[PDB]
Amino acid sequence: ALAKFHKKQSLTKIEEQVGSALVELQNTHPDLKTSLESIILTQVKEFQINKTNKKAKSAVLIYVHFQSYRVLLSAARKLIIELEKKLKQIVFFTAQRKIESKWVKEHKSQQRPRSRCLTYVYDALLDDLLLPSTLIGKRIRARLDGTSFYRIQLDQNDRDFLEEKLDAITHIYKTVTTREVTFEFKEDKTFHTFKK
């Protein structure tokens, strides 16, 4: 539907499927009705995960308007499950973040809130992708020359949902951001006082 979009002009074959696909789920499943009623879309981008295997395995990332970001996270799990079943493609939800300029300030009486800065915006997606579960440890490495590798620590109990998307994420990030992102699984680090 052009309904579930903000620009409301024209959609792309991908964006279109996503629209009806969404409208589908709120009619089909009674539970996602409430949440999906709310959800609006900003834009959707498709990315090809090209591996040396000459295999074409694509997935698509969808930009949920910030207004519905709360809601999007509220049912995030179930939503992505159905969208992947109903589109046979890998699905990722992000927030539509607007980045502010560093030196291009123009409104004398306007300060650039850190909330919308490049470090913080680009760092956002990573949380968004692995979505269902947020990371435990994040790190940076400086290869001699000057590369920066982000080996990120992911929870063990989530090996399911995250192991698969794992390659897509890497590839979407390298495209949007510019950051190489390798992951590493570590058993969760429960630190409490076991007391028998």
Binding site: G137, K138, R139, I140, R141, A142, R143, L144, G146
Partner: protein, 129 residues
Amino acid sequence: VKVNILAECLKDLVNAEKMGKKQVLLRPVSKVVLKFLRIMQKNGYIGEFEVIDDHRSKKVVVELIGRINKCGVISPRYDVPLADFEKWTNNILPSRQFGNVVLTTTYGILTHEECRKRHTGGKILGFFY
């Protein structure tokens, strides 16, 4: 309290190479601490290094090759016209062969030497040899 963590981090590190530590954990870290680090790294003094995300202000771990002889900062970071250079080169560096007096410019941070290339330099930051 604390001040010029670049100094905090720097000596903690020297104490490392000097004691023969195999690697170092620098507690309070900043952009500066890191830039300086990749400048030493780039010139080949320190080895690979990792920045852990302390949700407050990151902690860094630097591998120790074994070539660092000394790396400190300089008290107030005086200003230094390009004309003020030899003064400091003969002053801080152990020779006219290990030129590494890091400075801050408007053109960022350059090696004692690079500043002559870019032709500007400005305030002193630290040194390593």
